[PDB]
Every structure is written in C-alpha cells, then in structure tokens.
Amino acid sequence: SSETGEMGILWEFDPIINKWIRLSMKLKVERKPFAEGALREAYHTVSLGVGTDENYPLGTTTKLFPPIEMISPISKNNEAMTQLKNGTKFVLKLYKKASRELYFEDVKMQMVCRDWGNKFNQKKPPKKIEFLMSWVVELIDRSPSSNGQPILCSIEPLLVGEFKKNNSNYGAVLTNRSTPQAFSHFTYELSNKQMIVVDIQGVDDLYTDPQIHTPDGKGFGLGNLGKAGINKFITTHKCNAVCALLDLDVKL
Ligand SMILES: [Zn+2]
C-alpha cells in the first residue's frame, strides 16, 4: 500500500504445523490510546496492506526468537493477508517495561486455543465458538528499545460490543452461561487431562485473551498456574446441558 504509514514485521503462528510464519505489513497507528491498564495500553490502528518478508531478510540470529528450525519458509497459506487486508481497522496492544519469548508465547497460546475452538465446533454444539486471531509485530521504523531489541507489540482484530468474562484463570465462574464452561471442560478431557483452556472471555462467543493451564506448569506464559489452576477450575465446575450433549464424563 502506497500511503504514509509505519512499516512492521508481522509474525503469525500455525498450530497445525507447529511453526511460525514470517511476514511484512504497513500500518497507521493513532497517537493516543483508547484503553489503559497497569500492564498494557491499547491503540486503534488501520492496515495499509500485508506483504511477504523477502525485503527484510531474517538472517542468522543467535539470541532471538524464534529459531530458524521453528520458522516456516513457505508463507502462502495464512490468515493475515485476508484478515489484515488493506483498509482494515484493528487493535494494537503495548506491554510496559516483558520479554521477547513470552510475547510470542501469548500468540502461540492464542492460536492453540483458536484451534481447540474449532475442535469444539466440530462436535456441532448449540452455540459455536471462535477465538480471535492474534499476531506479534516488530515495529522496525521505530528506534529500538533501551536494550538492542526492536520494539515489540501484539495485535488483534477489533472486538466490538459488550465485553464479558465468563470464567477466570484461577477457577472463578462469572456468568450463568453454560457454553464457555463446557468448552473449558471439553479441552481438559479431550486433551487427556494434559491442558485446559480457561479465562474464557470476550463479546458473546467471540473470544480473546485466554489462558492455558498444564499439569507440569511449563509453557504458555506466567499466567499458567499449573495443577493448582486446573484444580481450581475443577472444584468449582458444574456440568451442564452442553457438557452432556458432548459426551463429557462428569468426573474430572
Ligand atoms: Zn462439564
């Protein structure tokens, strides 16, 4: 896209292949954020097109993430081209002060959840589910951080409407809605008790910002509360109609 904007390197994860896709994009960001936290700020932004990474060759990196073996050389099949197509309005998130690896893990996590989202929908439930696409972006045209590292930011599509938390990452149950609860339960059982997708939130059944727990506690960022988090979900969990429809064992 021709018009005056910022350039950026766009990373997309493929949970099917377990590999990272590398891309380029041009984007126009608003000077002022429309949201704040103690942790992060959110900025409205427009896509001025998505392209391939060829002009910005990755080279041989020693200490960055991800490693080359983790990268897919082919990029042809991806969501970004279409979802972040020229003209598209979206959200840009910025974390204050954590590390590179963890930024990528968030996006990895998101994709894994999105995937299980589709696995859930395959079983033809009354209400279908979707997790938002997310992406890592390297802001190249901006001068790098205090350390050598360039400026990193996460990105997702606009999420319009009344935002609702249905469960939490530590066993809270926050809505009478039964679908979100069933979905987390579903993920626990069908993963052979290896993972849960909790912290299910968003507008209706369009979800974002999830969190995964795993027994060993390894992976999926600092929000992974391991066996503890899994227990908390289970101790508060009451199976419902949708649990039942899916042949979900009442015992966890
Ligand atoms: Zn259940």
Author numbering: 553 to 649, 655 to 809
Sentences from the paper on this structure:
Dictyostelium myosin-II heavy chain kinase A (MHCK-A) phosphorylates the α-helical coiled-coil tail of myosin-II, causing contractile bipolar filaments of myosin-II to disassemble into inactive monomers. MHCK-A is a member of the atypical α-kinase family of serine/threonine protein kinases. The α-kinase domain is bi-lobed, with the active site located in a large cleft at the junction of the two lobes. The α-kinase N-lobe is similar to the N-lobe of other protein kinases but the C-lobe has a distinctive structure and requires a tightly bound zinc atom for stability.
We purified and crystallized A-CAT in the absence of nucleotide, and were able to obtain a crystal structure for the apoenzyme (Apo-A-CAT) at 2.9 Å resolution. The asymmetric unit contained eight monomers of Apo-A-CAT (labeled A to H) organized into two nearly identical tetramers (A-D and E-H). The X-ray crystal structure of Apo-A-CAT reveals a novel autoinhibited conformation for the α-kinase domain. The active site cleft is an open state, but nucleotide binding is blocked by the side chain of the conserved Arg592 residue in the P-loop. Superimposition of the Apo-A-CAT and A-CAT·AMP structures shows that there is a rotation of the N-lobe relative to the C-lobe. The main component of the barrier is the side chain of Arg592, which is translocated towards the front of the catalytic cleft by the upwards twisting movement of the P-loop that occurs in Apo-A-CAT. Instead, all eight molecules in the asymmetric unit exhibited a strong difference Fourier map that allows a phosphoryl group to be unambiguously placed in a covalent bond with the side chain of Asp663. The inhibitory position of Arg592 is reinforced by interactions with Asp766 and Tyr647, which in turn are positioned through interactions with the P-Asp663 phosphoryl group. Of most interest is the interface between molecules A and B (identical to the G-E interface), which involves the insertion of a phosphothreonine residue (P-Thr612) from molecule A into the Pi-pocket of molecule B. The interactions formed by the P-Thr612 phosphoryl group are equivalent to those formed by Pi and involve hydrogen bonds with the side chains of Lys684, Arg734 and Thr736 and the main chain amide of Ser735.
